[PDB]
Amino acid sequence: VASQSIIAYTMSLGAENSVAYSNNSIAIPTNFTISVTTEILP
């Protein structure tokens, strides 16, 4: 059994990430995505 109710929580700010930084390490994109996005202004 499962049912719906009002939960309350501390909000998450975003997923955790640790950048793989190093004295001589670089990440370079091997591809791309063209992305189309709306912006709406009155």
């Binding site: 909000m11 700010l13 975003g14 955790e16 990430n17 950048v19 930084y21 001589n24 670089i26």
Partner: protein, 327 residues
């Protein structure tokens, strides 16, 4: 970036525990719903301003356990993990330099404001959550440059990132490598002067203190306006009701209703005007976050005096401090 959220109510402000005045106030119609709505429209906007300035990152980026960045010493702007409130050293100064009249947490002039139905509401994001967004923006900036603004955070060694910046200002990258130690010492000694500047200067956070003081003065003026007679025999409502008969007592209260309701419309109009200049500043700060932290700016003087190289955000009570680095 934001100001204190406030809420009020005609039922208590105009006449606390007073059903007789409560019935006279119904004759004035919708004004109390307009005032409550207007203050709620300001209150929801303070979260929006804070979220547009700080919540620009999608992931909480973190710096590695080894904190070597080409000789550049970020230890006074990166978070101090020994503290309960996980802010940086410089953020600590900012929180102690600007005093907050009321935090708005569970329950002085703070009490007396509340006594008359004027309430202060807490911000949605706590000062810990603003420190997490700020340390994520900073961890992205010192481990991946501008790339975390455009897509994934892509690592690069910090001296090679600073070399790209030098190329952006039209100085060939070979120059940076030749003066690396000099450039790092200049930067480290410049960050050393921020602390002393902020610690010694009484007026440095003036634009944030001013907002706190205007929020405190506006509520003090509004709660002081309850003692005004407005042409009535008294400002004390049960004094009137005891000394005068129902016909005469009613008109005396009316004066007090008309006057107090003017003190609220004044406060809410002053607040709606003061909210508009805070939003203008929050939109500027959100623009400065995108263009000076997530990028390098060709715009003259937009990211401090000089040719812009990079900028670092630091949270403050009701604001943001940008540490702009320039050649």
């Amino acid at each position: 970036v934001s100001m204190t959220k406030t809420s009020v109510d005609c039922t208590m402000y105009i006449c606390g525990d007073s059903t007789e005045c409560s019935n006279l106030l119904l004759q004035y119609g919708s004004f109390c719903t307009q005032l409550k709505r207007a203050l709620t429209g300001i209150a929801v906007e303070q979260d929006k301003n804070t979220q547009e300035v700080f919540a620009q990152v999608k992931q909480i980026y973190k710096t590695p356990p080894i904190k070597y960045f080409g000789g550049f010493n970020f230890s006074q702007i990166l978070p101090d993990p020994s503290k309960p409130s996980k802010r940086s050293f410089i953020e600590d100064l900012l929180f102690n330099k600007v005093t907050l009249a009321d935090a708005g947490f569970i329950k002085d002039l703070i009490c007396a404001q509340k006594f008359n139905g004027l309430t202060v509401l807490p911000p949605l994001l706590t000062d810990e959550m603003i420190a997490q967004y700020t340390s994520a923006l900073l961890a992205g900036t010192i481990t991946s440059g501008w790339t975390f603004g455009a897509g994934a955070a892509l690592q690069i060694p910090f001296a090679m990132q600073m070399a790209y910046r030098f190329n952006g200002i039209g100085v060939t990258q070979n120059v940076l490598y030749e003066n690396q130690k000099l450039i790092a010492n200049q930067f480290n000694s410049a960050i050393g002067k921020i602390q002393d500047s902020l610690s010694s200067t009484a007026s440095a956070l003036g634009k944030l203190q001013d907002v706190v003081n205007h929020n405190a003065q506006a509520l003090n003026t509004l709660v002081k306006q309850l003692s005004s007679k407005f042409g009535a025999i008294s400002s004390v409502l049960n004094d009137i009701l005891s000394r005068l008969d129902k016909v005469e007592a009613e008109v005396q209260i009316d004066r007090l209703i008309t006057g107090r309701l003017q003190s609220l419309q004044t406060y809410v109009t002053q607040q709606l005007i003061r909210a508009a200049e805070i939003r203008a500043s929050a939109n500027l700060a959100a623009t400065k976050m995108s263009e000076c932290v997530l990028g390098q700016s060709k715009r003259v003087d937009f990211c401090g005096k000089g040719y812009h190289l990079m900028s670092f955000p630091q949270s403050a009570p009701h604001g943001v401090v940008f540490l702009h680095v320039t050649y």
